[PDB]
Design a protein around this ligand. Structure first.
Ligand SMILES: CCCCCCCCCCCCCCCCCC(=O)O[C@H](COC(=O)CCCCCCCCCCCCCCC)COP(=O)(O)OCC[N+](C)(C)C
Ligand SMILES: CCCCCCCCCCCCCCCCCC(=O)O[C@H](COC(=O)CCCCCCCCCCCCCCC)COP(=O)(O)OCC[N+](C)(C)C
Lengths: 392, 392
């Protein structure tokens, strides 16, 4: 832990805090209600979810190291250049500083020639260049390893599924809103954005051509084909085929939701029955993911709970109240779709679904943030698939 | 070096940087030229000089520790709770954050009931309370030791002059502008500040009653009586009486400058000869301080220079270019009064002297910042007065 690393963590976090405060006041007074900020909020939602994911990943690394979860061995990392929690904090703070600066430029641009729609383009271009620049520049080993995983994950059936690919595909399943916002940005730039004044002022926000449904299922599709690939590599259907069923429930939920969204303008009487199908399949998917979590993912609700009631018999975390709060919050957050459909169906507030998605996306990232702790703890305690050698 | 200490250093410095940037832009556009900002700049000049002194003191501690200057033994400190450079950085960053917040409130106040003239009052009241609050609160040992020294220094003839009192009195001699601004704040509040709207909009800026001359000489008076006290304790006139002469040159310079400032309105023909006396005594004082610095204070220009030309024979700092640049910059900064009188006499710009003092006060703090390095290095190498036991 070099002194300048912690200094950069604190420096970036302090600049981040002051910039978030400045953003809040700028939105309160400086921002004008005439321009619609929904495309802006979606693009910067993708960015902010990435930054929040990096912060929570640093917290996860901190918890794993101070609890005993040997995530270095689980992730198959070299124990020489493994990224510490502080380094993830610098990455998150750096990208958050550029996020805040780009958003502030979108609020007020202190340049007369440079337009506003380039600031997000420049921001995400800097993210991509930071990820893929060939030179041995900032954190070269980390992003090279991440780029290798990003290549292996998106071409899943042709590579043997190790733990790193699984884990990253699950994080992508949590961060599907980032892919959603990337697709929305591309569609908005190519079709709706008038390259004249700004990005303020929609044929890309809905499922008109069904492309967004494909983007929704892309993480689910990768996980599904990884389960099938693991079936081919090891003929054992009990974990893998049921997990693939768990992801195909997501497939069915997404396609029925898209079908209802398309049919709401068609006027077909089958719209109501498609809504029924979407609701029941959302129930099935929510219970399927929740049960899989608490049983096979976290390993809780074991038959050998003992003193640790409603839990397993080895516990590495200090307080069990963490476990019970995690179980509960998992129940609501997996079933948060019930809350969202209730508020979007019992109210007539304009652009309700956009607000609901905007607030519940960080809650989904937080849900996977909590999921990481107990999934990796379960893996550290007893092997689940991707070890095949020892318990550790 | 705890991790959270460096984290607080970085956090405070980052907030400081963003707040200084916000202050710059606020002064560029938000600030209104109708209100005179000179009293504001003087009060916050005292504050900023204190913060800059703390930053440079942290830099000095860093240099002393990584060079070998045993300032812990020289200052007579317990080697258990001695303040590290990082802790001084937290103190400086904390006070700088409150300084920036108070100045920003003076620019725009986000409160309708609270007036503007309390923000500096609240800021310096917080400084005093942080210094003198009896509880074992933030950095209790440090400010207790500092308060003991602040008591011993201001009552000098009745206490035996150790190194700590000398050193702190010299820093007060450098930071005489802080006492100047404190006196100006008290006089402005008591006489000129209308407690109706704000501090914007002078019988306290000049030497009308000669009080400011006393405030100027107060650090010089303390050093003079410390030299006399050291003469009484040790009958040896060679260091102490000549040093007291060095400070009485400051006395003569200050009283002649005040006499000229008073006589400029009298119209007496003796005004010109008083200006001559002030100029020649400023020359004498500048050469007296500069020669004392490079000869007895820093120990340079020794007769045993050897390879280290124009220096001494033991050097602890890596590069000699530091020494030569220090010598030079000492020549200009001690003689910076020549630059200031030249620009204030050959130009007719309004409020020139205020600008000159505002810019050259941090240069005086920087001059003592450089003075600390070589004075403490000379003391570490060979004893100068306040050791009497060993060379170290
Ligand atoms: C509209 C939204 C558009 C969004 C824009 C597109 C997204 C931009 C993508 C760029 C941002 C990502 C910044 C890169 C941070 C990655 C840091 C990282 O991977 O640290 C990890 C830390 O190691 C760990 O496994 C512990 C924590 C788990 C790390 C999980 C990987 C991080 C995933 C975050 C990026 C996901 C991609 C998101 C795309 C939407 C790699 O470690 P290492 O390489 O340094 O050491 C391994 C030893 N070697 C190297 C020798 C093999
Ligand atoms: C208009 C302007 C008005 C200005 C307002 C008035 C000024 C406000 C005054 C409050 C600000 C000062 C904040 C206090 C910081 C002091 C920190 C400090 O003294 O650290 C020092 C660090 O120790 C050292 O000696 C090394 C560096 C030299 C320290 C020099 C003292 C600092 C002087 C700064 C304040 C000067 C006062 C300025 C008044 C104008 C004390 O160490 P310690 O107490 O922690 O350890 C010693 C062991 N014990 C304690 C057991 C004996």
């Amino acid at each position: 832990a070099p002194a300048w690393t912690t200094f950069r963590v604190g420096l970036f976090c302090g600049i981040f805090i002051v910039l978030n405060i400045t953003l809040v006041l700028a939105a309160v007074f400086k921002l004008e209600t005439d321009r619609s900020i929904w495309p802006l909020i979606r693009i910067y939602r993708g960015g902010f979810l990435l930054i929040e994911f990096l912060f929570l990943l640093g917290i996860n690394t901190y918890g794993w190291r101070q609890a005993g979860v040997n995530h270095v061995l689980i992730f198959e990392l070299n124990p020489r250049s493994n990224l510490s929690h502080q380094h993830l904090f610098e990455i998150a703070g750096f990208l958050g500083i550029l996020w805040c600066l780009s958003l502030l430029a979108c609020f007020f641009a202190p340049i007369s020639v440079i337009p506003t729609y380039v600031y997000p383009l420049a921001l995400y271009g800097f993210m991509v260049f930071f990820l893929i620049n060939p030179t041995k520049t900032f954190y070269y080993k980390s992003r090279f390893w991440l780029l290798k995983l990003l290549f292996r994950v998106f071409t899943a059936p042709f590579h043997k599924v190790g733990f790193a690919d699984f884990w990253l595909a699950d994080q992508l399943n949590s961060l599907s809103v980032i892919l959603m916002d990337l697709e929305y940005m591309i569609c908005f730039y190519s079709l709706e954005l008038k390259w004249d004044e700004s990005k303020g002022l929609g044929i890309c926000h809905k499922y008109t051509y069904g492309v967004r449904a494909i983007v929704q299922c892309i993480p689910a599709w990768l996980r599904f084909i990884q389960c099938l690939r693991r079936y081919r590599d090891t003929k054992r259907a009990f974990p893998h085929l049921v997990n693939a069923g768990k992801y195909s429930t997501t497939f069915f939920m997404v396609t029925f939701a898209a079908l209802y969204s398309t049919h709401k303008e068609r006027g077909h009487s089958d719209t109501m029955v498609f809504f029924y199908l979407w609701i029941v399949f959302y129930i099935i998917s929510s219970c399927y993911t929740l049960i899989w979590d608490l049983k096979m993912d976290w390993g809780l609700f074991d038959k050998n709970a003992g003193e640790n009631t409603f839990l397993r018999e080895e516990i590495v975390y200090p307080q069990k109240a963490y476990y019970y709060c995690a179980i509960i919050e998992d129940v609501i957050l997996r079933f948060a779709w019930t809350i969202q459909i209730s508020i979007t169906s019992t109210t007539l507030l304009p652009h309700s679904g956009d607000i609901i998605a905007t607030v519940f996306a960080p809650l989904e990232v937080f849900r996977r943030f909590v999921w990481n702790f107990f999934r990796l703890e379960n893996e550290h305690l007893n092997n689940c698939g991707e070890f095949r050698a020892v318990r550790d």
